[PDB]
Amino acid sequence: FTPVVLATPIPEEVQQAQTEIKLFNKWSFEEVEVKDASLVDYVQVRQPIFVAHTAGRYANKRFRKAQCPIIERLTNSLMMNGRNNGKKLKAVRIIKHTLDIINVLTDQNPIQVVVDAITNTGPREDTTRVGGGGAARRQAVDVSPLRRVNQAIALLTIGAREAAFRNIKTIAETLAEELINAAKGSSTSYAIKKKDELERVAKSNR
């Protein structure tokens, strides 16, 4: 690392976070290894990105959706429920505010906390109407690893959406305690409570 002087003043803080290593905005995407197997190669890690604003051409096919970062995935589920459909300017901004909260509470790496919560939240059993005809009912099957992150991220973002609805805790903070609770587990998380309900319901259908 060395400072660079130039005709137009470029401040020093921006330069540092790219020379020693290509970081996030202010945080790090390395040492975010996934502790629980069967999810690695589906939760995208080891290629950091600066900002979650990126339009990747990922839409012609069936299985290349394990290559875009989990961070931008979580951002893209904030844009839902009508009035805020699209508008990725605020989806990025809200997640910018969220990572400030997991930085201060649960002092673990905010990227690590998010990734840990995703693995801990994805149900591994679900129901399906299967039978030999009209005599068909709930049937228990297993959830694929790609669907797990799909199922997991859905509950995390909608918990903040519904909880910040008609409640003063903003979306930027209401998503924090969901991740805080989803990672370690307290059964007061919106997503974790849905997870155990879904698994137990599927278990009863054996």
Partner: protein
């Protein structure tokens, strides 16, 4: 005979045309330093060309960008394509080639868009629906 070159980048309907010449290395956004894009989030998304390969490669060359058309996020993507190509174009036929190719793997490895732009354009609307693909609705009574 001032050394100079000009290339362009784009987005959905935006078209940026950066001017790449040898100089002190000042960067402008249509009149102003590149620190004043002001989405305040996409700033590192357009800092990507400057910082991914380092500012020493941009130290001896200045860039002036003119951006037209598109949306607000589209104009930011316009700037990054032209700046990425401009360094590649300058290092191809003023600087030695072995700098140019190693720059290509510097860009296309991290984000594909910087040198090869998207092949996606808006689709015309069709009668029978509000947009290009959806229908209005249907009612049978």
């Amino acid at each position: 005979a001032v050394p100079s070159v000009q290339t362009f980048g784009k987005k959905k309907s935006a078209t940026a045309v950066a001017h790449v010449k040898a100089g002190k290395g000042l960067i402008k956004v249509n009149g102003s330093p590149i620190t004043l894009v002001e989405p305040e989030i996409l700033r590192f998304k357009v800092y990507e060309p400057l910082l991914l390969v380092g500012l020493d490669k941009f130290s001896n060359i200045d860039i002036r960008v003119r951006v037209t058309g598109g949306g607000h996020v589209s104009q930011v993507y316009a700037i990054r394509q032209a700046i990425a190509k401009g360094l590649v174009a300058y290092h191809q036929k003023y600087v030695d080639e072995q700098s140019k190719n190693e720059l290509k793997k510097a860009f296309t490895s991290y984000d594909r868009t910087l040198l090869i732009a998207d092949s996606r354009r808006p689709e015309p609307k069709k009668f029978g629906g509000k947009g290009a693909r959806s229908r209005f609705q249907k009612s049978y009574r």
